Every structure is written in structure tokens, then in C-alpha cells.
Structure 1
Amino acid sequence: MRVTVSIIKADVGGFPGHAHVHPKMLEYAAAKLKEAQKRGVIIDYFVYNVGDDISLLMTHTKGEDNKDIHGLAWETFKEVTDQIAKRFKLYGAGQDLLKDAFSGNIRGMGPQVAEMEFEERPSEPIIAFAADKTEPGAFNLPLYKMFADPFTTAGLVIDPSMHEGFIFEVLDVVEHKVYLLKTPEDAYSLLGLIGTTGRYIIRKVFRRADGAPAAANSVERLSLIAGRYVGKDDPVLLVRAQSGLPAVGEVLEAFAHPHLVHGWMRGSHAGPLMPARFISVDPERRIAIGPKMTRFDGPPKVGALGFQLHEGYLEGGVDLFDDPAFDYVRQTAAQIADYIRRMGPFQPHRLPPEEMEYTALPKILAKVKPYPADQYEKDRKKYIEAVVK
């Protein structure tokens, strides 16, 4: 049967600040999806956060971009906001709900969506990822590695079925243009685009042999609402694994180096993406509680829950960064976070001025007197004595 797997995620309130979610928020979302499941809206669901981002993972047969699935997640977030976040005066209550009324599609309203529809395979293993305190281009390097780096995914070289490579759908989120690139032939051009992780973001990946969908990363073109740019809020990512697609372990290997990503404190710094464990995973209650953000509102972290689909039912999730081999990767990330933080407010630890979520440049350039550099040279001495006097 064809099945759609959708992750719809928002930050609708933190506890405290942007450190984590209030557990009643997940409990409320899970009870609400349980009712949708009883009514036949969806087949199955799993609710979880990483930091203060909540992901609603839902399986159903209504296809991609479906009004009722998008509206169900909208209402679940609205209700969590009204009944829990506003009630407890959570920090940034309702923050990612940026319109008063649902239009038909949740994309561009604040929440992030990653979804794929496909024929359910004889075994259908999938992994859902959520990263907090970063942007969707944080997954550019791991998506490139798992689908196109033969030092990550050994099947590209030793598995006859993966020899033909993959198709990447890359969104320019500034000029709203899509590029389709194919590896191995196009790997250098692809990198020339996706290395600029704030602008050119891998949105989907397809198997080249047959076009099957292999991954979907949540990203939208930038738009402006109120003060705010939307499109590059903290991402969620779905990946199908095995049988012509990368093995679950090749997918996870692509996260084994905790690379520097943009976001962290005030969406304005770069720091290492730490692959973190969930605090708890309860497959019976359909709820996982993910890790907190602490020093400097991070470092940014990514969680991974693996599932096996059967007729759309989600058996899991399984925390796939729970292994002493990944402790070494978390230890490297903790040490790199401490190293780069000693840089304080300088690039490249602080982001490039056009990529900053926060600025006071406006207020500075309004108080500090500029001198044309030509005239300044002639008068340096006067200017300095003036400042001294």
C-alpha cells in the first residue's frame, strides 16, 4: 500500500527560555493525535521534542501537502499553545504560529514540514531526525555525505544496486529557484551550491535508478511576516534506509563528525551539531523526551529515532545515537563548543552580518560618527586630540 510519512514540527513554547519543552505539551499532543487516529484521520503517530522544538510524526494515506494532515498539526500546536504554553506563561508561547488562520497548507506559516509518500516496502525502515538551535542547511553536510560520499556510505562503491547514485533537489531559498543535481557526475557543482548552507538547501533526495524518494528535509523559501523571516526555523528530516538506499548505519555515520552549523545562541553563531540521546523513549505512550539546550542555548543538537513501518503503523521509535561509539562524538562536540566559545562575538563563531537572526548594527551606525576615509587621513591628529581633550 502507499503510505505518507509526515513530520510537522514547531516551537510553541519553552521551559525555561529555549532550553526544553514542558512535558505536558507532549502529553497533550499525543492525546490529541490518539483521537485523530481513533477517527481514522491518521494511521499512527509519535510525538517528541529536541530542545524546545516539538515534532509530530504521523503516518496516513492522504498524500503530501494534505490540508487535513497540515490542519490537524496546526490545531494540535494551537491547542498546546492555548491550553499549556499560555497557561504556564512558557517562553515564546505560540512562537512559530505566525498567522491567525489556517489557509490549507502549514508551509510558510512558521512550522516545518518534511514528508514523503511511497509504496511501503517488504521492510520499510525509516529514521526521523530533529535538530534544535540550527537551520535546515545544517543537514546539508550529512545528506551529502550519506548519499554521495563514498567515505561515509560504503554501498556507493560495494553495492551494485547504489552504483547509479542519487538526485538532489536543492532549493535556493533567497531567489526561490530549484536545482536538480545528480551524483556522482554533478558532485562538485552540487557542493558549490550546498556549501552555502544558509541559501542553498537540500530539500529532497531521490534514488536515480527508479526515482524512489529517499529523504525529505524541512525547508521553505524565505518570506517576511511581522518582524520575522520564516523558512529556516530548526529543521526535521526523514530518511528511508536499506535495499538500494543507504543502510541505517551509513545514514548515522553521516552524523558521526559533529560539524559546525549556524544557529545556537540568538540564531547568530556557529557551533558543533552534537548527536544526542533522548532522555526517555516510551513506544507505548508514543512519546520521547529529547535533550535540553544549556550553555549558550545549545550547543545545537540532533536526535534520531528509527522506526519500522507495517501497513503504516510505526513500530519504534529507537534512539539511534545511543551507543558508546557516539559518546566519543559527543565528547568532541563538547570540547569544540568550549574552544569556539572563547571567540565571543567575532566571526566565524558569530555569523556573517547578512546571516544574523539578531542585530544591533542599526542602533550602532545611528550613534557612531563616520568620517570619510580620505578626509580622515588629513585630519587624524585633530580628530584624536579632540577625542583626548
Structure 2
Amino acid sequence: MRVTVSIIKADVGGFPGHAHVHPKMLEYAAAKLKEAQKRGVIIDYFVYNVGDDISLLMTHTKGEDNKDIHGLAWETFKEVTDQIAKRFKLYGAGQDLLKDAFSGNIRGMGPQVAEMEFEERPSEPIIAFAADKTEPGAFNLPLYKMFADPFTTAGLVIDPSMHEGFIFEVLDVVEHKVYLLKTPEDAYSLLGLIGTTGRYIIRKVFRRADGAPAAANSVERLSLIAGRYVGKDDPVLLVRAQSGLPAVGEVLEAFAHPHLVHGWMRGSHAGPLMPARFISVDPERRIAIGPKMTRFDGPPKVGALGFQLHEGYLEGGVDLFDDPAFDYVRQTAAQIADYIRRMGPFQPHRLPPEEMEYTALPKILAKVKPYPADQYEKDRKKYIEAVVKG
């Protein structure tokens, strides 16, 4: 049977600030999806947060880009907004749905979606990822590693079924152009694009041998609003594993170096991506509570839940960053976070100016007097005396 797996994610309020979600939001969402399941809209579901982002993972047979499934998610987020977030006056209530939400970040751009449709294999292990305080390009390095780096995915070299590699669908989110690159042969060209994490983002990956969908990342084109590019952050990602696709452990190895990503405070910094445990996982209630964002509204975090599909039912989720081996990775991220923070307001800890979600540069340039450089050389002594006397 063919199944679709859809993650539709949104922030509709934080608790407090942008640090976390209120547990009643998860409970409300789970109850709403249980009703949809009883009506046959969906087969199964799992509800979880990372930071202030709620992921609705849903299995169904309606295909990709389905209005009923996308509409079920939207309605669930709108009802969480109105019944829970507005009731408790949560921070940024309705953030991703309402352009006038009470927060100062990018609002009203809508949910994000990562989805795949496929014939369910004789065993169908999948991993759902969610990150907070980062951009969709945060997953470029891990996706490259797991599908194309022989230092990550041993199977590329030792599993004859993987020898032919993978096909990357890369979205230029500025010009709205798609590129298809094949590894190993196009590795250098691919990296020339996807190293620019804010512009060229891996959106989908397919197995080269047969075209099977292997991963789907939530990324959309940017919008140009009041002369700035405006994106949708805090990505979600679906990866299918095993049997010629990377092993669960090869997928997870791709997150074992907590690389610097763009986001963190005010969408305007770089910090290490910490692979984080869930606070709690309740398979029966279909809810996981993910990590909080604390120092400097982070560091950026990613959570990983594994599942096994059966006739579209989801057995799981299983927290896949829960191992002492990943404690070392978290400790590294914590130390790097402390190191980089001592840079304060300077690039490359602060992002390049065009990549900053917040800026005061127009306010600054409206007040600080410029001097054409060539004329300034003649007048410098005069201008310095004027400040001094001034």
C-alpha cells in the first residue's frame, strides 16, 4: 500500500517567550488529530515540539500537497491559537498564522511542510526531525553527509546496494529555481551551492538506483517584503532509513558534529546545532515534549524521533539522541556556545547583514552623519576638533 507521511509544523505561541510550548497546546492538538483519525481523515499521528515549534506528524493516504491534510493542520493550529494560546496570552500567540501576532519576529508566513508518498516497505523505519532557532539550510550539512559523505555513511562504500548514490533536489529560495545534482559525480558542484545555506537548500533526496524518495526537508522560497528577504525558519525533516537507504545510525552520525547554523537569538546569529533529548515521550498519548531554548534563546536544537510504519500506523516515537555517545556531542555544543557568545555583536557570530532577521541599520544610517571619504581626508582635523570642542 502507498502511504503519505506529512509533518506540518507551526509556532502558535511560546511559554515563556520563544523558549518552549505550553503542554496544553500539545494535548489540544493530539485530541483534534484523534478526532480526525476517528473520522478517517488520517491513519495515525504524533504530536511534539522542539522549542516553540509544534510538529503534527500525520500518516494518511491522500498524497502530497493535499488540501484536506494541509487544512486539518491549519485548523488545528488556528484552534490551538484561539483556545489555548490566546487564552493564556502566550508569547507570539498565533505567530506563524497571524501577521499581527504579539511578537517582534517574522509572523504570519504559515506552517511548514515536509512530506513523502511511497509504497510502504516490508519494514518501513522513518525518522522525523524538528529544529528550533535555525533556518532550513541547517539541514544541508547533515543531509549531504548522510547521503554523500563516505566518512558518515559507510554503506556508500561497503553496501553494494548504495554504490550508485543519490539525487539531490536543491531549491534556490531567492530566484525560485530548482537544481538536480547526483552524487558522487556532482559532489563538488552540489557543495558549491548548498554551502550557501541561506540560498540553496536541499529540499528532497531520491535514491539514484530506482528514484525512491529518501528525504524531504521543509523549505520554501523567500518573500521580498519592505526590501528584505523573508524566509520561514525552524525546519522539519523526514528521512526513510535502511535497505539501501542510510541506516538509522548513518542518519544519526550525520548529526554527531554539532555544526554552526544560522539562527539562534533574533534569527541573527550563528551557533552550534545541539542534538537534544526529548523531555518526555508518551507513545500511547501520542505526544512528546521537546527541549527548551534557554541561553540566548537557544543554542539551536534538533530532536529526532524514530518510527516503524505498518499500514500507515506509527509505532513510536523513539528518541534517537538518547545515548551517552550523544552526551559528548551536547557537551561540545555547550562549550562552543559559550566560546562563540563572547564575540557579541560581531560577524561571524552575528550574521551577514542581508541574513539578519532583526536590524537597526536603517535607524543608524538615518542618524549618523556620513562624510564622503575623499573630502573627509582634507577636513579630518577640523572634524575631530569639532567633536572634541563639541
Fold match (TM-score > 0.5): yes
Contact 2:92 2:103 in 1 (8 A): no
Measured in 1, the distance between the counterparts of 2:229 and 2:110 equals: 9
TM-score (norm 2): 0.97
Contact 2:173 2:222 in 1 (8 A): yes
Q: Residue 223 of structure 1: CA displacement?
A: 1.6
Q: 1:190 to 1:85 in 2, by over 3 A?
A: same
Q: Residue 63 of structure 1: CA displacement?
A: 0.1
Q: Residue 120 of structure 1: CA displacement?
A: 0.1
Contact 2:94 2:101 in 1 (8 A): no
Specify the alignment match of 1:283 in structure 2.
283
Q: 1:98 to 1:208 in 2, by over 3 A?
A: farther
Measured in 2, the distance between the counterparts of 1:246 and 1:368 equals: 55
Q: 1:105 to 1:123 in 2, by over 3 A?
A: farther
Contact 2:223 2:229 in 1 (8 A): yes
> 2:51 matched to 1:80?
no
Measured in 2, the distance between the counterparts of 1:330 and 1:230 equals: 30
Contact 2:63 2:117 in 1 (8 A): yes
Specify the alignment match of 2:106 in structure 1.
106
Structure 2 gap ranges (5+): none
Q: 1:140 to 1:108 in 2, by over 3 A?
A: farther
Instruction: Say what the alpha-carbon RMSD is for the aligned residues.
Output: 3.1
Measured in 1, the distance between the counterparts of 2:120 and 2:9 equals: 23
Specify the alignment match of 2:237 in structure 1.
237
TM-score (norm 1): 0.97
> Segments of 4+ in structure 1 off by > 2 A?
98-109, 224-232
Specify the alignment match of 1:26 in structure 2.
26
Q: Per-residue CA shift, 1:18-38, capped at 9, x if unaligned?
A: 010000000000000000000
Measured in 2, the distance between the counterparts of 1:81 and 1:101 equals: 10
Contact 1:108 1:230 in 2 (8 A): no
Where in structure 2 are the equivalents of 1:246-261 lying within 5 Å?
246-261=246-261
Q: Residue 233 of structure 1: CA displacement?
A: 1.5
Structure 1 stretch 151-160 or stretch 99-108: which is displaced more? 99-108
Specify the alignment match of 2:91 in structure 1.
91
Q: 1:272 to 1:29 in 2, by over 3 A?
A: same
Measured in 1, the distance between the counterparts of 2:24 and 2:103 equals: 28
Q: Residue 232 of structure 1: CA displacement?
A: 3.0
Contact 2:277 2:321 in 1 (8 A): yes
Measured in 2, the distance between the counterparts of 1:284 and 1:56 equals: 16
Measured in 2, the distance between the counterparts of 1:313 and 1:208 equals: 28
Q: Per-residue CA shift, 1:157-184, capped at 9, x if unaligned?
A: 0000000000000000000000000000
Contact 2:164 2:208 in 1 (8 A): yes
Q: 1:101 to 1:212 in 2, by over 3 A?
A: farther
Measured in 1, the distance between the counterparts of 2:368 and 2:171 equals: 39
> SS state of the match for residue 366, structure 1?
helix
Q: Residue 227 of structure 1: CA displacement?
A: 9.7
Q: Residue 231 of structure 1: CA displacement?
A: 3.7
Contact 1:107 1:113 in 2 (8 A): no
Report percent identity of matched pairs: 100
Measured in 2, the distance between the counterparts of 1:320 and 1:156 equals: 22
Q: Residue 98 of structure 1: CA displacement?
A: 4.4
Structure 1 gap ranges (5+): none
Q: 1:4 to 1:230 in 2, by over 3 A?
A: farther
Measured in 2, the distance between the counterparts of 1:63 and 1:101 equals: 32
Q: 1:99 to 1:294 in 2, by over 3 A?
A: closer
Contact 2:105 2:266 in 1 (8 A): no
